[PDB]
Design a protein around this nucleic acid. Structure first.
Ligand SMILES: [Zn+2]
Ligand SMILES: [Zn+2]
Ligand SMILES: [Zn+2]
Lengths: 66, 604, 380, 52, 54
DNA sequence: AGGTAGTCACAGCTGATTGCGCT
DNA sequence: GCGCAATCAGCTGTGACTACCT
């Protein structure tokens, strides 16, 4: 059996996570099991780097007025 | 000066809040003006601020203006004096003018009329009332090259001397750095040397009050000064130029951007100036209607600044044209004046007054500052919100509706980064479905539709899929003209596609719906021009972007000019009745088939 | 010279200060200048009117199938005609509308000349799905209109409106003789074309005293119809014009009383649908006939049934309210409370009526001159 | 096919901005509108294709 | 040269169909660690999959 | 440890060539 | 055979992406 964290999101973010897995942008293949087109299963020891990558992707194409 | 919350606070600087709030204005120490629109004195305060400063944003409640040296030069150019402007600013301050503006205003306004530039007998001279300033600038190395041969003293009468004609731009750039800005005043009332023409506009072309204000500010004390007037394309822009040309009553030269804008200006002159066709000439190497010996000449850029070999007839026409003075040289689409070859155009012809007209003064590369000395100060800036409130400008309901990225496309979008992702978010199936739904809806409600789409490679399959007319751009001259001519007066066809061709001042007919897809990156000028093609909720225009892509950032950063103008972009996330009818790319098979044909570019 | 080439206008020179704070008072005057932006007249045009027997002629040729106005000319024309009928009956209490349709070189009287608004709208809605065939015949429609309107009393203004879509008409006889006959009969004919100007329509409108117009778009069509809505001006005193008309009271029937007699409406009896068997309605003052709609002329005794409020709504034009004398507050020596709203008088100007010498504030003066149309003080 | 149509519609019409908006609507007012003024303002500010 | 260049790539770009390599992890025999832990190693990319089997 | 001349896409213009039409 | 219109070469504007020195 597999123990970790279930992540639910839109298919675009799921595919972004898949690309991160295949490109080894986090340094390893920790994105192990894919269950649904909109749900994935990720080991919980590196949820922080995934959050940082998601935030960087989100605010990259944002053009903050600050 | 203090940064307790990261905000520049000036509470201690301006405490003069005597009694008590009746003045709807706030001043800033460095420089800024905040105006309250919901005031009984709103019109008078607006008129006062327009004549002295240029706006930086005009929302519905609190306008914000900026104080600049060129704005003060324009203010002092009009009959307004230093004492009057200072006392009226102090009159409506509600907080007290900080002691950093009065000194700044005084310094800007002191050196206005000290140095003047004049044109006489095809010769450029610089005249100064005070002889000392000439010796002040004599030691400047850049100026000394203008005189030839050294212009020992040029004893006249008031001290003046000749300058090199082709180096006028350099001295214009230097003078402002020397705190001695030049002024371009043409006293056309009494010349007796220039052959004035018998142009006279018909007394049937009435003009709106804002055009009256712009013209009145152009001619403040019986003389015409070079300036820039910014008016929307739908509003009356050519009429202002025609009226200015008639008032100047001199030989007029009009410069357009495209080879079709010259015909537009000729039509405007024939409509509102009552000028015989013999005097009107167009010099664009198409008919050559004897431009030699003409009163009004109309031509375009990229023809007066050729660095290559020129046609034999064109060479003689240019030689004749460069041998006489010009009255009120009119430039169209002045925003694209600061170019590598367009700047020298003003140096290749000699004219007294240079009047520039445009609708979108915003431009990248921060070269608009150069336009302050290339032509003159920003004279008039029309308020678009109050313009559309009077009903003479269509109130366009702006919309920014985005579509999610399809799963078959987002993987490729995140996979590639070397400039190959443009087609991926340009040809988003969801955006295609949204565009098709909008087209069908506005055809069912019978609205004229213009669909702007750059990246014509995508526009090909975007337009042939719906089997609708489109303008590739490198097609021909007749086909585009006939398509645009039959677009308006034909009930069967009411939707057209334009690929970066309509990004200028053309003769496109009235339309109510504009849909832009995959435009340039941050071209605020392009989006403002596209919006200008609609106004003339009577109308409304949509912008389609793809989520989680660079197009979102581009749309966010390109709409700031319009929100400064006062428009608001409502976000639409769901389209009502999207699944009510059948649209293209309904199933995943054709969506995944699209990947092969969109990656089939392989431009390597 | 030119007006804008002289001196630049400084509109901000109006405001002045003398006590370093008086500017507020000035803007107060601006607020007082903000009000009174009207001419104290909701219409401001014709102060009287005259009865009209208007005939609307509708083309039914193939040209109505053109899609210049979405979806086609016929549909937009009938929609705007329904709007015109509603507005015309709203602004004319005792007028009448007849409808003629020209088709296949013939003229058919779609609806008889009457004052019922509902009947005409239903007839137009039924005629929406008609078949457009043949070519129009202005001669037949004009002959029918003249024949019907020939016997109308002279005081009534006889008007004919023609909506001419097709550019060609088939005339079985000379039309200029008909035009001369219409001119001798004092009939006003106005034409609103759809495609382009036609010589015969222009000549007819010029000779009969009417107006000929050509549609630019749907908005211009509606503007022309609205212009035709307004009644023509009438003389101060023309003739002995009087008409016998009744005023039916809207008596409903309740089972609590013993005088509840159900009855079928005379108008509803003539319809194809089942007549409404309602408790009660409008009873004719002459023959006690039951009707459900007003104003409807009685079918039995020929009397006209008109609602009194409709006639009374235009009485304020006969007796316009005289403008009150504007008096500054300081110069008035009296009570400082408004006679109408009982509010304290603080404005710089106080209005006093010339009859009752009562004081009204700006708001009360505007309300009286715009809506009330009667001085409350003079009522007492 | 018919199943492909439904799958594509499910993927498209509810990808990012529905998985939370629909849930919020399920947990929303539910009852009638606040005032008629709100409905009039919403109708004025809505686009013609969103009112059909 | 232009008219041959415009057609030389037409057949070049019509051959390839699948660009992305198949990432299906074909794990080999499981390796048993302590505490009933089982690790699977991908023979294509070296992905390690550690799981507890009941 | 952080910024600008080539380069690319997509349009414009003018200066020649260059095959097409013939009561 | 001559004349008009279609076509391309060369240059430029606009906006954005990218490889070596303070
Ligand atoms: Zn009766
Ligand atoms: Zn009152
Ligand atoms: Zn009274």
């Amino acid at each position: 059996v597999l123990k970790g964290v279930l992540i639910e999101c839109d298919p675009a973010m799921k595919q972004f996570l898949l690309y991160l897995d295949e490109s080894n942008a986090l340094g390893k293949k920790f994105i192990i099991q894919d269950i649904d087109d909109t749900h994935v299963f990720v080991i919980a020891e590196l949820v922080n780097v995934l959050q940082e990558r998601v935030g960087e992707l989100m605010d990259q194409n944002a053009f903050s007025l600050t | 000066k203090v940064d307790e919350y990261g905000a520049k606070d000036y509470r201690l600087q301006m405490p003069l809040k005597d009694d008590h709030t009746s003045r709807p204005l706030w001043v800033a120490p460095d420089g800024h003006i905040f105006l309250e629109a919901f005031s009984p004195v709103y019109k008078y305060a607006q008129d006062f601020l327009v004549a002295i400063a240029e706006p930086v944003c005009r929302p519905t409640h609190v306008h914000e203006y900026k104080l600049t040296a060129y704005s003060l030069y324009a203010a002092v150019s009009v009959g307004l004096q230093t004492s009057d402007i200072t006392e009226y600013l102090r009159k409506l301050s509600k907080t007290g003018v900080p002691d950093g503006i009065m000194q700044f205003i005084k310094l800007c306004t002191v050196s206005y009329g000290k140095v003047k530039l004049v044109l006489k007998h095809n010769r450029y001279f610089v005249e100064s009332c005070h002889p000392d300033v000439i010796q002040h600038l004599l030691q400047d190395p850049v100026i000394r090259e203008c005189r030839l041969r050294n212009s020992e003293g040029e004893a006249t009468e008031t001290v003046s001397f000749e300058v090199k004609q082709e180096m006028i731009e350099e001295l214009q750039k230097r003078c402002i750095h020397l705190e001695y800005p030049l002024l371009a005043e043409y006293d056309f009332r009494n010349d007796s040397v220039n052959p004035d023409i018998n142009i006279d506009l018909k007394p049937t072309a009435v003009l709106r009050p804002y055009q009256e204000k712009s013209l009145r500010k152009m001619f403040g004390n019986g003389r015409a000064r070079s300036g820039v007037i910014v008016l929307p394309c739908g509003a009356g822009k050519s009429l202002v130029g025609v009226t200015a040309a008639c008032t100047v009553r001199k030989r007029c030269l009009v410069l357009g951007n495209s080879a079709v804008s010259v015909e537009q200006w000729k039509a405007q002159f024939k409509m509102w100036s009552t000028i015989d066709d013999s005097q009107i000439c167009r010099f664009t190497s198409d008919a050559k209607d004897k431009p030699i010996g003409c009163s009004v000449a109309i031509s375009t850029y990229s023809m007066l600044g050729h660095t290559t070999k020129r046609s034999w007839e064109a060479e003689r026409v240019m030689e004749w044209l460069k041998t006489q003075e010009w009255g009120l040289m009119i430039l169209d689409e002045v925003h694209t004046i600061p170019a590598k070859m367009f700047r020298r155009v003003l140096t290749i012809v000699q004219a007294h007054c240079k009047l520039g007209l445009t609708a979108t003064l915003v431009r990248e590369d921060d070269k608009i500052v150069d336009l302050n000395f290339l032509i003159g100060p920003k004279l008039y800036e029309a308020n678009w919100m109050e313009l559309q409130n009077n009903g003479y400008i269509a109130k366009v309901q702006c919309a920014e509706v985005w579509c999610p990225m399809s799963p078959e496309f987002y993987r490729e979008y995140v996979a590639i980064k070397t400039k190959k992702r443009i087609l991926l978010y340009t040809m988003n199936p969801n955006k295609f479905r949204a565009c098709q739904f909008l087209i069908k809806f506005h055809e069912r409600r019978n609205d004229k539709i213009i669909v702007f789409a750059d990246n014509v490679f995508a526009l090909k399959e975007y337009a042939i899929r719906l089997n609708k007319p489109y303008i590739y751009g490198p097609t021909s001259q007749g086909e585009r003209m006939q398509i645009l001519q039959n677009f308006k007066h034909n009930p069967k066809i009411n939707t057209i596609f334009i690929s970066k061709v309509g990004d200028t001042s053309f003769d496109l007919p009235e339309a109510n719906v504009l849909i832009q897809i995959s435009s340039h990156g941050g071209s605020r000028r392009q989006e403002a021009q596209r919006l200008g093609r609609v106004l003339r909720y009577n109308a409304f225009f949509y912008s389609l972007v793809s989520q989680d892509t660079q197009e979102m950032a581009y749309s966010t950063k390109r709409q700031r000019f319009l929100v400064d103008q006062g428009y608001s972009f409502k976000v639409i996330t769901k389209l009502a009745g999207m699944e009510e009818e059948d649209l293209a790319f309904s199933t995943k098979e054709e969506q995944q088939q699209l990947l092969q044909k969109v990656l089939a570019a392989t431009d390597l | 010279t030119k007006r804008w080439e002289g001196g630049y206008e400084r509109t901000w020179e109006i405001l002045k200060e003398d006590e370093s704070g008086s500017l507020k008072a000035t803007i107060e005057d601006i607020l007082f200048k903000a009000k009174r932006k009207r001419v104290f007249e909701h219409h401001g045009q014709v102060r009287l009117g005259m009865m009209r027997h208007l005939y609307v002629v509708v083309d039914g040729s193939r040209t109505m199938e053109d899609q210049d106005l979405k979806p086609n000319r016929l549909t937009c024309t009938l929609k705007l005609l329904e709007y015109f009928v509603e507005e015309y009956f709203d602004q004319n209490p005792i007028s009448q509308i007849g409808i003629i349709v020209t088709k296949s070189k013939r003229a058919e009287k779609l609806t008889e000349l009457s004052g019922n608004p509902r009947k005409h709208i239903t007839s137009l809605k039924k005629a929406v799905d008609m078949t457009c065939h043949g070519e129009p015949s202005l001669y037949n429609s004009l002959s029918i209109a003249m024949q019907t309107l020939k016997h109308m009393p002279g005081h009534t203004s006889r008007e004919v409106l023609i909506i001419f879509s097709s550019l060609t008409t088939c005339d079985p006889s000379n039309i200029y003789d008909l035009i001369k006959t219409l001119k001798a009969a004092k009939i006003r004919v106005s034409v609103i074309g759809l495609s382009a100007e036609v010589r015969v329509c222009t000549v007819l409108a010029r000779e009969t005293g009417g107006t000929y117009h050509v549609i630019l778009d749907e908005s211009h069509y509606k503007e022309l119809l609205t212009h035709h809505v307004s009644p023509p001006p009438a003389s101060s005193s023309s003739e002995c014009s009087l008409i016998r008309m009744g005023f039916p009271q809207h008596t409903i029937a309740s089972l609590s009383d013993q005088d509840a007699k159900p009855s079928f409406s005379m108008a509803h009896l003539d319809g194809n649908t089942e007549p409404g068997l309602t408790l009660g309605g409008y009873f004719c003052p002459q023959c006690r006939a039951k009707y459900c709609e007003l104003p409807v002329e009685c079918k039995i005794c020929g009397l006209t049934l008109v609602s009194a409020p409709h006639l009374a709504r235009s009485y304020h034009h006969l007796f316009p309210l005289d403008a009150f004398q504007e008096i500054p507050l300081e110069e008035y020596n009296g009570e400082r409370f408004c006679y109408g709203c009982q509010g304290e008088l603080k404005d710089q100007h106080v209005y006093v009526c010339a009859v009752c010498q009562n004081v009204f504030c700006v708001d009360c003066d505007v309300f009286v001159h715009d809506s009330l149309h009667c001085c409350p003080g003079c009522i007492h | 096919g018919t199943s492909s149509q439904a799958e594509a519609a499910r993927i498209l019409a509810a990808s990012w901005p529905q998985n939370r908006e629909d849930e919020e609507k399920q947990k929303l007012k539910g009852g009638p509108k606040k005032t008629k003024r709100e409905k009039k303002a919403a109708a004025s500010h809505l686009f013609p294709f969103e009112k059909l | 040269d232009k008219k041959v260049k415009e057609l030389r790539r037409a057949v070049r770009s019509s051959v390839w169909k699948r660009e992305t390599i198949v990432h299906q992890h074909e794990y080999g025999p499981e390796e048993n660690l302590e505490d009933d832990m089982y690790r699977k190693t991908c023979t294509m990319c070296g992905h390690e999959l550690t799981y507890e089997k009941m």
